[PDB]
Design an enzyme around this catalytic site. Structure first.
Site, PDB file in Angstrom:
ATOM      1  N   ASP A  89       0.678  -1.368   0.015  1.00 55.86           N
ATOM      2  CA  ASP A  89       0.195   0.065   0.060  1.00 55.86           C
ATOM      3  C   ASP A  89       0.794   1.228  -0.053  1.00 55.86           C
ATOM      4  O   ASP A  89       1.993   1.391   0.640  1.00 55.86           O
ATOM      5  CB  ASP A  89      -0.888  -0.004   1.058  1.00 55.86           C
ATOM      6  CG  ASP A  89      -1.949  -0.845   1.141  1.00 55.86           C
ATOM      7  OD1 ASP A  89      -2.285  -1.688   0.539  1.00 55.86           O
ATOM      8  OD2 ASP A  89      -3.013  -0.656   2.180  1.00 55.86           O
ATOM      9  N   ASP A  90       0.298   2.306  -0.591  1.00 55.81           N
ATOM     10  CA  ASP A  90       0.648   3.738  -0.366  1.00 55.81           C
ATOM     11  C   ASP A  90       1.471   4.224  -1.446  1.00 55.81           C
ATOM     12  O   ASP A  90       1.738   5.172  -1.256  1.00 55.81           O
ATOM     13  CB  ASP A  90       1.202   4.053   1.198  1.00 55.81           C
ATOM     14  CG  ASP A  90       0.328   3.793   2.305  1.00 55.81           C
ATOM     15  OD1 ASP A  90      -0.951   3.686   1.947  1.00 55.81           O
ATOM     16  OD2 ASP A  90       0.570   3.716   3.518  1.00 55.81           O
ATOM     17  N   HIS A 123      -5.756   3.024  -4.071  1.00 51.49           N
ATOM     18  CA  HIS A 123      -5.715   3.026  -2.320  1.00 51.49           C
ATOM     19  C   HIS A 123      -6.361   4.380  -2.334  1.00 51.49           C
ATOM     20  O   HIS A 123      -5.874   4.993  -0.904  1.00 51.49           O
ATOM     21  CB  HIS A 123      -4.333   2.682  -2.017  1.00 51.49           C
ATOM     22  CG  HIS A 123      -4.254   2.442  -0.469  1.00 51.49           C
ATOM     23  ND1 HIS A 123      -5.430   1.932   0.041  1.00 51.49           N
ATOM     24  CD2 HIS A 123      -3.499   3.195   0.548  1.00 51.49           C
ATOM     25  CE1 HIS A 123      -4.926   1.896   1.542  1.00 51.49           C
ATOM     26  NE2 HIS A 123      -3.894   2.649   1.681  1.00 51.49           N
ATOM     27  N   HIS A 159      -6.453   9.629   0.936  1.00 48.14           N
ATOM     28  CA  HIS A 159      -5.984   8.611   2.183  1.00 48.14           C
ATOM     29  C   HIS A 159      -6.599   9.466   3.378  1.00 48.14           C
ATOM     30  O   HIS A 159      -6.131   9.297   4.524  1.00 48.14           O
ATOM     31  CB  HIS A 159      -4.562   8.207   2.146  1.00 48.14           C
ATOM     32  CG  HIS A 159      -4.169   7.203   2.774  1.00 48.14           C
ATOM     33  ND1 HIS A 159      -4.346   7.059   4.268  1.00 48.14           N
ATOM     34  CD2 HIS A 159      -3.997   5.869   2.439  1.00 48.14           C
ATOM     35  CE1 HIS A 159      -4.046   5.673   4.718  1.00 48.14           C
ATOM     36  NE2 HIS A 159      -3.661   5.153   3.573  1.00 48.14           N
ATOM     37  N   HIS A 219       3.655  -2.101   3.009  1.00 48.47           N
ATOM     38  CA  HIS A 219       3.872  -0.786   2.639  1.00 48.47           C
ATOM     39  C   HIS A 219       5.091  -0.568   1.663  1.00 48.47           C
ATOM     40  O   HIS A 219       6.120  -0.574   2.772  1.00 48.47           O
ATOM     41  CB  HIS A 219       3.674   0.142   3.791  1.00 48.47           C
ATOM     42  CG  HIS A 219       2.102   0.332   4.464  1.00 48.47           C
ATOM     43  ND1 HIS A 219       1.994  -0.721   5.397  1.00 48.47           N
ATOM     44  CD2 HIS A 219       0.850   0.656   4.193  1.00 48.47           C
ATOM     45  CE1 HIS A 219       0.663  -0.530   6.048  1.00 48.47           C
ATOM     46  NE2 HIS A 219       0.108   0.178   5.181  1.00 48.47           N
TER      47      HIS A 219
HETATM   48  O1  LIG Z   1      -4.454   2.342   4.896  1.00 50.16           O
HETATM   49  C1  LIG Z   1      -3.863   1.439   5.420  1.00 50.16           C
HETATM   50  N1  LIG Z   1      -2.958   0.774   4.730  1.00 50.16           N
HETATM   51  O2  LIG Z   1      -2.261   1.394   3.727  1.00 50.16           O
HETATM   52  C2  LIG Z   1      -4.149   1.233   6.843  1.00 50.16           C
HETATM   53  C3  LIG Z   1      -4.848  -0.003   7.269  1.00 50.16           C
HETATM   54  C4  LIG Z   1      -5.172   0.067   8.447  1.00 50.16           C
HETATM   55  C5  LIG Z   1      -4.606   0.759   9.652  1.00 50.16           C
HETATM   56  C6  LIG Z   1      -4.193   1.861   9.108  1.00 50.16           C
HETATM   57  C7  LIG Z   1      -3.774   3.009   9.968  1.00 50.16           C
HETATM   58  C8  LIG Z   1      -2.816   4.242   9.769  1.00 50.16           C
HETATM   59  C9  LIG Z   1      -2.505   4.267   8.050  1.00 50.16           C
HETATM   60  C10 LIG Z   1      -2.995   3.318   7.248  1.00 50.16           C
HETATM   61  C11 LIG Z   1      -3.780   2.253   7.817  1.00 50.16           C
HETATM   62 ZN   LIG Z   2      -2.617   3.251   3.274  1.00 48.64          ZN
END
Ligand SMILES: O=C(NO)c1cccc2ccccc12
Ligand SMILES: [Zn+2]
Length: 206
Positions: free
Chosen positions: A9-10, A59, A63, A163
């Site tokens: 992710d991200d 994604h 965000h 990530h």
């Molecule tokens: O978006 C996310 N994964 O990329 C994610 C999943 C679950 C908890 C999180 C907490 C802070 C930031 C991202 C997340």
């Molecule tokens: Zn994320």
């Protein structure tokens, strides 16, 4: 047949090319969930992810928890991100990964909007906890992340949350690959034509 779905992710980001090389060196395929601003900054990495057999999905744009869920912009953002990706690879992905996971953000009404928009939603079955070791020494953090994943891997299908924008996550991947191969997992990308539900709502429509 045991299959492990590594998901990242991200991104994309400055560690993604190295990750792609690592995956290729172990003939592993994975899944990437991209943020729109990074799609715009790193189009060549988006192209490379898709060209090298990995699944590229969405994604979101911001965000931002409040925008996506409370203000209900989830599907709009995923559609915008979809278009940015399609501009590069000529394919419009259907799979989305919710920022912060689907629970409790993706309520009844939003899950309907997801389905109606032709999207799917994947959460995960194993959280690598890679964020816990942010800014810690990379090789030690990587080893800890690898053991977080390796011990939690028990089911025939596992979807692993990582990530690729963090160095320690990318560094953990060789040990994760080795550890799971030994336990009879193969590493595949997500496949739209072979969708199965993996979400916290156990909503079998997405
Ligand atoms: O978006 C996310 N994964 O990329 C994610 C999943 C679950 C908890 C999180 C907490 C802070 C930031 C991202 C997340
Ligand atoms: Zn994320």
């Amino acid at each position: 047949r045991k299959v492990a779905y590594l998901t990242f992710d991200d991104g994309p980001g400055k560690y993604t090319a190295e990750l792609l090389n690592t995956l290729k060196q172990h003939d592993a395929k994975a899944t990437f969930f991209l943020i729109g601003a990074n799609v715009k900054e790193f189009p060549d990495l988006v192209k490379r992810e898709n060209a090298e057999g990995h699944y590229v999905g969405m994604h979101s744009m911001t965000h931002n928890f409040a925008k996506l869920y409370k203000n209900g912009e989830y599907v709009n953002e995923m559609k915008e991100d979809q278009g940015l990706i399609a501009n590069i690879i000529g394919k419009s992905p259907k799979l989305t990964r919710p920022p912060y996971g689907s629970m409790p953000g993706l309520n009844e009404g939003l899950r309907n909007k997801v389905v109606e928009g032709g999207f799917k939603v994947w959460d995960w079955t194993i959280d690598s906890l890679d964020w816990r070791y942010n800014k810690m020494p990379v090789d030690a953090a990587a080893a800890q992340i690898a053991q977080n994943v390796l011990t939690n891997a028990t089911k025939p299908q596992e979807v692993i949350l990582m990530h690729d924008i963090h160095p320690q996550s990318v560094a953990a991947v060789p040990a994760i690959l080795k550890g799971l191969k030994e336990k009879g997992y193969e590493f595949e990308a997500y496949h739209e034509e072979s969708h199965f539900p993996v979400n916290f709502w156990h909503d079998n429509r997405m």
